[PDB]
Design a binder for this molecule. Structure first.
Ligand SMILES: Nc1ncnc2c1ncn2[C@@H]1O[C@H](COP(=O)(O)OP(=O)(O)OP(=O)(O)O)[C@@H](O)[C@H]1O
Ligand SMILES: Nc1ncnc2c1ncn2[C@@H]1O[C@H](COP(=O)(O)OP(=O)(O)OP(=O)(O)O)[C@@H](O)[C@H]1O
Ligand SMILES: Nc1ncnc2c1ncn2[C@@H]1O[C@H](COP(=O)(O)OP(=O)(O)OP(=O)(O)O)[C@@H](O)[C@H]1O
Ligand SMILES: Nc1ncnc2c1ncn2[C@@H]1O[C@H](COP(=O)(O)OP(=O)(O)OP(=O)(O)O)[C@@H](O)[C@H]1O
Ligand SMILES: [Mg+2]
Lengths: 258, 373, 70, 111, 59, 56, 339, 48
């Protein structure tokens, strides 16, 4: 059943509504499920929300990380570390340290919570592993490979990890990748530029040219975006070579007219 | 076809939801814990180690220190596992526990609900490049409000004072509120809108307080952009005549001015003053030591009208081709708000023609109607 | 005009229990003691059957209802 | 039992009070219309009766109200809770000046 | 006590050159006050200047 | 500190303590009960609240 | 074992010495009549660890919440945040840089500082120093300037005016803020009280509009009391500031209260030149200026407008990154048919 | 039955609240009849 739920997750990873409601279904599973399914669910929650620490999912993961079953607690704590992966959210870190305080007498749990803070602080929040990519369009094959290896390993945390082998986290590290917007122009010249960044708006269907930027936060070129926010650059300063601004980009210095 | 498919599938969803509710059964009634588990025994234990009261510390008398605390029970206490003695501050909110009353945790200052929700931390959904007809005014505002903040070493090298205080004035509806929203959205600093009505209360004592707490809040925050609106409402001509009973508003205005610039630095607070009748404004407030760069919004010219027209045409379902400069020509002496209403009228005319295209004909009809009314 | 003598003079000439009250000395302290003390003085007046309950000027109370307020 | 000092702003009222206080050599109670207090209720009359009781106990004494304009006010009706409270304070003064609180060896000053 | 008028007035305005100037000659333009008014302006404005950091960098 | 209210019998007095509650208590003998009278202030004790000393 | 007595006294004096008033003193040895936050009234035959004489009816003293013995007394307290507002970080400006205004600064500096420092002359002459001062800033031009510049003396404290109208609707109080303020000034060393915007208080005192008025009149009368009553008030210096010159209380007016009512006039051409020079001192001005002719152009440019114009000129030059005065873009910064 | 004005305006639990309840109950009467009476017409309630 654990692998079955993990496969449900490994089928539902894209569509936002489907992922949200797969999380709802996984909560149903955890509540009205066996202890095996209970240990399984948090991993699937992480799969759905990788590096996407939403308040509701964090609440659920903490809920079922303070669970009596050590395996359930292990799965949930690592899942919460993953959903916090490379985000450094203050609320998440505070909850993490409170949970570490609470689990003061549990050595393996303390180990896992330490790794959870490490995940929350990945590269000090500069590198973020993500299956999805390109405005939730591109599938990261190597990233999914590594993530699935890690989560299969954690399907049985007690024996697989709390023992000899614990380097599937290094496999995940190899699977790591950044989220960043260097506008290195022609000849890799680090041409700076003001970019208006805001949470995506699902441009489809809406009126006119939808303002994909929510909460305009003009922050020059060296920005990190976020799990689900996109950029609109500026009025006409430059002409980007791509409309899906991400990573290494080039900005043609050919505005039609200032 | 498609509509019937919708209705069917949404019926299926409603049935599914009611089926879930009836089958499993989740509700609250009076108080509830719907989220499973929530066991909080350790929470109870630490609550007992805590669940402290709070008061306002008064003075640290001696250099073991003697903190003085006032509420329904006075006290003189000190010492705690807490450090940073009194966080180098006296009039805080101490947050001290019971049981020998010497353990503390600092707290922010109490502030009345009015200012609490006037903080208006939301970000209005407007951005530059959506403004036409006031390029010079927006240039001035951008300069004053950004150069001191964005790469401002160039602004300090020249040894020139940083302007602080701008009053937007003009005819009723020119994009002043729009530009204020745009600046609010773009800026990254403690932004605080203010409504004049909320500063008028039952008799003396209220406005002056709320103003003072607002100002100290702004001072505590690193750098503030305050956005008074309704200045015409708050603060007027100082003359009494028959206002001998109405002197409350004048008093509040006087305290406002004193906090703006009195016998103390006012701080890194930049003030925006929205108005449309910039004559009854009191001379003391209008003093350019407090409103440095008054900006005037005028009716847009032809190019501004065209730019606003295309901006509003940003919306879809519009004609493939429209000739906006003639649209602007047909609407002279028209506010940008009137351009917006013309686009709205064109949409409504398309609807009342059952047309999913907003044609230049629709625009002409809307212009004719608005002009005639 | 001389109301206060007529008061004191009857308070003396009388052969009966007498209680003097001030116009507004019954509004103070925590909330709600005014009604208690007025009923208290009236209870004492009842106890002293031949009782005369004189109150100084009243204007400071009972002059108007002043309409609903909070 | 009482005297009044019609005076424009500085004719010599307060200095006159100083002189009489230093001259007579008995108890003196210089009190001002800034005795008003409020704890979700009125206690000005209570303070007034405290004053008068103190004087009556210290029979030889000169009480000196100054700036009686403020509390003296007027018997405005339907003015406001503040007006009612102030007139109540005035009324305490009247009752304890005249009335059953009749004095024998105190003296009152007003200005 | 400035050289013009040889003034000693107690009102004498005491400048950044520590000199109770003549009531009419208290100004730097007049007495070549050797002070770095502009440099002090630059320092003070740099100290007091607010800069918006855009609140995006985080640990 | 509280003011007596009535000479209840001989070794009994109703005293309204300033804090607000009203009590009935007996007085130490060496107090010349004639002295204290309705309105007189007195200093009752912590535990038993017997009138210890009358005050002006 | 005297030491041991001291340490055990200390330990039984644990710490949380609940503070209580000293409402009254008596004797029969002396006693105490203390009162506590929790409204209560404890007679103490043994006052405690105090001389029983320095006490005075009205005082705050630590007490053992159970023993109710007056423990170490604490310095008096000041409410309504009068103490918090009565702070000043030594305003940075050191010079009296104002402009042409000279007689005003002369009289003010004399009447204030000379009593403070050279009181020897006053005592030798047998003269009580000059009486409380008023300072008409009808337009405000130079008002806060003179105040702040005066905030450069050797050492003193300045009580600003800040919401003395902080009075509750339910009658409120006769400016308890004023009471505490004057108390603090009296207790501290030579002190000064800058009544800013005094116009906010003060009036003919007879108008009978409505409530709030009468509260302002009690606060005004409290002010009058605080300096005209049975009190020498020697160690005080009141300086008032107002712009509604005409409408003010005839008694608050002067002659023992607010004398030497210095007046701020409209700066002349010379005064405008001096103020603009003062504000330009730190400005990166090029070696070519018509300061005097700019003052002539001012044409009733009295107030801070000069400062605002220097700033606007800085920004104007900064459009292009310059250090020179156009002298006419300066007028447009200043601010058909015939002509 | 004083004229509905001043404070409360429906936010008060006082005679204003009682008036609101009375109006809600009234509207419906079938054959009952009601005779209000007052000394002054100046004060009246628009809702009533
Ligand atoms: N420069 C402009 N660019 C775009 N739209 C504009 C512009 N000026 C005005 N408008 C339109 O006018 C309306 C803006 O009203 P807004 O509240 O901002 O005006 P205001 O100048 O603050 O005055 P008022 O409060 O009297 O309307 C909106 O319809 C906006 O679309
Ligand atoms: N019939 C009277 N014979 C003598 N004196 C009188 C008489 N009536 C009034 N007075 C004078 O007035 C006083 C008695 O009236 P008093 O002023 O006590 O009450 P009142 O006239 O009802 O007014 P108020 O209640 O306002 O005090 C005496 O002190 C006396 O001076
Ligand atoms: N007649 C006087 N003779 C001498 N000095 C006087 C005289 N009147 C006032 N003064 C001086 O004025 C101050 C006292 O003022 P005074 O006693 O006249 O005030 P007041 O009349 O009570 O004032 P107000 O009516 O404004 O409250 C002291 O400096 C005193 O020297
Ligand atoms: N003569 C002057 N010298 C220097 N700065 C001045 C002068 N006059 C005005 N200012 C400027 O005015 C501002 C201070 O305000 P000021 O002291 O003039 O009072 P105000 O606000 O006009 O007073 P009011 O409350 O009476 O209106 C500062 O910018 C100061 O630079
Ligand atoms: Mg507007």
């Amino acid at each position: 059943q654990g692998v079955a739920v993990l496969g449900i997750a490994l089928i539902a990873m894209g569509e936002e509504i489907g992922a949200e409601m797969a999380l709802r279904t996984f909560g149903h599973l955890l509540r009205y499920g066996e202890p095996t399914l209970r240990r399984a669910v948090p991993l699937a929650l992480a799969l759905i929300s990788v590096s996407n620490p939403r308040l509701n999912i964090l609440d659920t993961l903490s809920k079922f990380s303070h669970d009596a079953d050590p395996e359930v607690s292990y799965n949930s704590i690592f899942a919460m570390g993953m959903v916090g992966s490379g985000t450094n959210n203050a609320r998440l870190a505070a909850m993490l340290r409170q949970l570490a305080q609470y689990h003061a007498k549990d050595p393996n749990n303390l180990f896992m919570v330490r790794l959870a803070q490490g995940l929350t602080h990945l590269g000090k929040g500069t590198l973020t592993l993500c299956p999805y990519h390109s405005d939730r369009q591109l599938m990261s094959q190597v990233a999914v490979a590594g993530l699935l290896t890690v989560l299969v390993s954690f399907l049985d945390v007690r024996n697989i990890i709390l023992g000899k082998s614990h380097y599937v986290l290094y496999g995940l590290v190899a699977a790591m990748q950044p989220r960043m917007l260097v506008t290195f122009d022609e000849e890799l010249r680090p041409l700076p530029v003001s970019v208006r960044v805001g949470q995506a708006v699902d441009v489809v269907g809406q009126a006119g040219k939808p303002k994909t930027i929510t909460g305009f936060q003009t922050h020059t070129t060296p920005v990190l975006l976020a799990h689900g926010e996109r950029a609109e650059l500026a009025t006409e300063e430059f002409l980007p070579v791509t409309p899906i601004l991400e990573g290494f980009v080039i900005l043609r210095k050919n505005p039609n007219y200032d | 076809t498609y509509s019937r498919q919708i209705k069917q599938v949404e019926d299926d969803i409603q049935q599914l939801l009611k089926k879930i509710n009836e089958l499993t059964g989740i509700k609250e009634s009076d108080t509830g814990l719907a989220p499973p588990a929530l066991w909080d025994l350790a929470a109870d234990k630490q609550t007992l180690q805590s669940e402290q009261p709070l008061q306002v510390a008064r003075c640290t008398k001696i250099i073991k220190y003697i903190i003085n605390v006032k509420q329904f029970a006075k006290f003189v206490v000190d010492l705690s596992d807490q450090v940073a003695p009194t966080d180098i501050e006296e009039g805080m909110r101490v947050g001290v526990d019971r049981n020998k009353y010497q353990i503390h945790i600092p707290l922010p200052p109490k502030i009345d609900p009015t200012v609490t929700m006037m903080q208006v931390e939301e970000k209005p959904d407007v951005t530059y490049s959506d403004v036409g007809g006031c390029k010079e005014q927006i240039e001035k505002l951008r300069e004053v409000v950004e150069t001191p903040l964005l790469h401002p070493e160039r602004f300090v090298n020249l040894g020139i004072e940083p302007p602080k205080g701008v009053l937007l004035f003009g005819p009723p509806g020119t994009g002043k509120t729009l530009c204020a929203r745009a600046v609010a959205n773009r800026t990254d600093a403690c932004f605080i809108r203010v409504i004049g009505s909320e500063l008028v209360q039952k008799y003396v004592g209220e406005g002056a307080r709320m103003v003072r707490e607002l100002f100290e809040m702004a001072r505590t925050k690193k750098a503030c952009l305050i956005f008074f609106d309704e200045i015409d409402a708050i603060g007027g001509a100082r003359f009494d005549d028959g206002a001998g009973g109405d002197n409350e508003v004048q008093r509040t205005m006087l305290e406002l001015i004193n906090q703006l610039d009195g016998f103390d630095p006012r701080g890194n607070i930049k003030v925006l003053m929205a108005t449309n009748r910039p004559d009854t404004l009191d001379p003391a407030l209008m003093r350019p030591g407090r409103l440095d760069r008054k900006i005037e919004f005028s009716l847009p010219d032809l190019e501004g009208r065209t730019h606003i027209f295309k901006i509003h045409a940003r919306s879809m379902s519009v004609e493939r081709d429209i000739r906006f400069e003639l649209l602007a020509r047909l609407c002279p002496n028209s506010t940008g708000a009137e351009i917006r209403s013309v686009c709205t009228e064109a949409g409504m005319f398309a609807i009342r023609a059952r047309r999913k295209i907003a044609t230049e004909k629709d625009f002409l009809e809307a212009v004719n109607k608005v002009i005639k009314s | 005009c001389g109301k206060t003598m007529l008061a004191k003079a009857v308070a003396h000439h009388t052969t009966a229990a007498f209680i003097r009250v001030v116009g507004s000395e019954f509004v103070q302290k925590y909330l709600g003691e005014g009604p208690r003390m007025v009923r208290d003085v009236f209870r004492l007046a009842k106890e002293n059957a031949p009782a005369i309950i004189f109150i100084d000027e009243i204007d400071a109370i009972a002059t108007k209802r002043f309409d609903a307020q909070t | 039992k009482g005297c009044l000092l019609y005076g424009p702003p500085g004719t010599g009222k307060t200095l006159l009070a100083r002189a009489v206080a230093s001259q007579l050599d008995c108890n003196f109670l210089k009190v001002v219309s800034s005795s008003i207090v409020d704890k979700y209720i009125g206690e000005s009359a209570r303070l007034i009766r405290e004053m008068f009781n103190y004087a009556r106990d210290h029979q030889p004494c000169i009480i000196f109200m100054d700036e009686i304009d403020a509390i003296g006010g007027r018997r405005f009706s339907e003015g406001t809770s503040a007006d009612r409270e102030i007139q109540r304070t005035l009324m305490e003064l009247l009752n304890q000046m005249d009335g059953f609180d009749t004095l024998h060896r105190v003296k009152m000053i007003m200005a | 006590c400035f050289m013009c008028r040889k003034k000693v007035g107690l009102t004498g305005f005491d400048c950044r050159c520590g000199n109770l100037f003549c009531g009419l000659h208290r100004y730097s333009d007049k007495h070549n006050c050797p002070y770095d008014y502009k440099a002090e302006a630059a320092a003070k404005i740099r100290k007091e200047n607010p800069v918006v950091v855009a609140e995006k960098i985080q640990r | 500190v509280g003011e007596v209210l009535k000479q209840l019998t001989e070794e009994k007095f109703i005293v309204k303590a300033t804090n607000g509650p009203r009590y009935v208590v007996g007085c130490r003998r060496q107090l010349d009960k004639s002295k204290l009278k309705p309105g007189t202030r007195v200093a009752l004790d912590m535990t038993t609240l017997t009138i210890m000393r009358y005050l002006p | 074992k005297i030491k041991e007595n001291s340490e055990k006294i200390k330990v039984n004096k644990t710490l949380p010495y609940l503070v209580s008033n000293v409402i009254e003193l008596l004797d029969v040895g002396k006693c105490a009549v203390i009162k506590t936050s929790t409204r209560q009234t404890y007679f103490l035959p043994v006052i405690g660890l105090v001389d029983a004489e320095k006490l005075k009816p009205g005082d705050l003293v630590g007490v053992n919440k159970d023993s109710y013995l007056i423990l170490e007394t604490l310095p008096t307290e000041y409410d309504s945040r009068v103490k918090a507002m009565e702070v000043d970080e030594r305003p940075t400006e050191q010079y009296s840089d104002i402009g042409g205004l000279d007689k005003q600064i002369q009289e003010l500096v004399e009447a204030i500082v000379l009593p403070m420092n050279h009181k020897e002359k006053f005592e030798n002459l047998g003269i009580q120093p000059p009486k409380g001062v008023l300072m008409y800033g009808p337009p405000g031009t130079g008002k806060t300037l003179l105040a702040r510049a005066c905030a450069a003396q050797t050492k003193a404290t300045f009580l600003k005016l800040a919401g003395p109208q902080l009075v509750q609707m339910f009658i409120g109080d006769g400016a308890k803020l004023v009471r505490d303020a004057f108390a603090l000034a009296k207790e501290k060393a030579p002190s000064i009280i800058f009544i800013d915007e005094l116009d906010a208080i003060g009036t003919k005192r007879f108008d009978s509009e409505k409530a709030g008025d009468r509260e302002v009149q009690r606060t005004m009368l409290e002010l009058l009391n605080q300096l005209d009553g049975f009190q020498p008030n020697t160690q005080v210096k009141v300086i008032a500031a107002t712009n509604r010159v005409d409408i003010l209380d005839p008694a608050l007016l002067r002659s023992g209260r607010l004398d030497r009512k210095i007046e701020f006039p409209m700066p002349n051409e010379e005064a405008r030149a001096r103020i603009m020079q003062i504000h330009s001192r730190k400005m990166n001005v090029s070696p070519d200026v018509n300061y005097e002719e700019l003052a002539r152009c001012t044409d009733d440019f009295n107030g801070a407008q000069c400062k605002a114009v220097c700033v606007e000129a800085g920004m104007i030059a900064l459009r292009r990154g310059a250090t020179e005065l156009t002298h006419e873009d300066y007028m447009e910064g200043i601010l058909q048919y015939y002509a | 039955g004083s004229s509905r004005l001043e404070g409360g305006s429906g936010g008060d639990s006082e005679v204003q609240r009682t008036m609101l309840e009375l109006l809600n109950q009234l509207d419906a009467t079938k054959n009952i009849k009601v005779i209000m009476a007052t000394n002054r017409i100046d004060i009246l309630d628009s809702a009533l």
